[PDB]
Symmetry: none
């Protein structure tokens, strides 16, 4: 129904202050003092941070405040922290059938910019994996920031053409991102190339990790 | 703000009925007749589908029913259609701090192809990494559908709370999902235990894989 438009996304640095608008009308936003803001970290249960346009639960950080001017309501966050990076929604009582209409969501990106190196870990294939006859060197990269890195492989000092499958990066609990890289292989092929390696390029930086095929040699 | 426990995921074939559950206390769910449900297509504005336990907003499909008994409430979607796939949340009015409490949500995945049990591959810490005075294990979950699983780690029949980091499952070419998880251990811990295990749950069925200290297959 009458969906309240919100900015698709705002971004700010720590300690700064963002504010999110909830476009509306006389029938909803500017019709009653019944707007609410919710904070949602995908995967978790939404939190009710704002209700009745300006109220705030006796437990929600006072860095969060709301209000409206005409047919527009808006949440404003002060002293951006880490937790703050989530999705924000506004909802409101309306004058029609619908008991309450919701905003379309605003994703707040709290940078922080505390840049960190991609501690990379290269794994050799596994024993069990050898049975059905499979082999895979898994390169683990974590605790890095920003969540932007490009990985490559050096198959025996030579970047031989192969099949590398760099996963869809994800954000960990510690905020820092963590990705990985896989280079599936074959029997005699992993025995042939004397030593495989991983190469994580993190913002004008590059760390290597080599793993040699073996059995306690 | 003690979230309303909900089922992480649910699946149903086109045309079937499904019931999602919301569990609370007499202080909120069993204290009022103010339980709401919302359908939400990620990246979209949440929609109010059920309210006051069973009330339904006009224009909303009578395929969506709500009911409650005791301190548990539950939504039911009958005659499933592909377009019904979305996240469903349930909320209730509270007596304490915050007035309204929410549930963790539930991804309703309507089956569109046969179910797919995952492939789990565990990895022992690389000796290379062991000399760096650090150990980390990796568990690979792949080839599964629907795209939802839970990963638990074990240290000799003993649950490993801290030190874990699982990733969100991502869809792949074959339209099945993959995902990973890694546990960070000091080298001591590693050799300190008989073995470690990776428990992977998918649609009820759980599989495990074990790996023991020092060896070269």
């Amino acid at each position: 129904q009458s969906a309240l438009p919100q900015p698709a996304s705002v971004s700010g640095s720590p300690g700064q202050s963002i504010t999110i608008s909830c476009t509306g009308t006389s029938s909803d936003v500017g019709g009653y003092d019944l707007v609410s803001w919710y904070q949602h970290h995908p995967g978790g249960a939404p939190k009710l941070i704002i209700y009745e346009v300006t109220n705030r639960p006796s437990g929600v950080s006072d860095r969060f405040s709301g209000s409206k001017s005409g047919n527009t309501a808006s949440l404003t966050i002060s002293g951006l922290q880490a937790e703050d990076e989530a999705d924000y929604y506004c909802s409101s009582y309306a004058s029609g059938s619908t008991p309450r209409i919701f905003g379309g969501g605003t994703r707040l990106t709290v940078l922080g910019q505390p840049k960190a190196a991609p501690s990379v870990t290269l794994f050799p294939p596994s024993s069990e994996e050898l049975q059905a006859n499979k082999a895979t060197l898994v390169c683990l990269i974590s605790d890095f920031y920003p969540g932007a890195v490009t990985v490559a492989w050096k198959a025996d000092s030579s970047p031989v053409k192969a099949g590398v499958e760099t996963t869809t990066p994800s954000k960990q609990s510690n905020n820092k991102y963590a990705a990985s890289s896989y280079l599936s292989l074959t029997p005699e092929q992993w025995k042939s190339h004397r030593s495989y390696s991983c190469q994580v390029t993190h913002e004008g930086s590059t760390v290597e990790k080599t793993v040699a095929p073996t059995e306690c040699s």
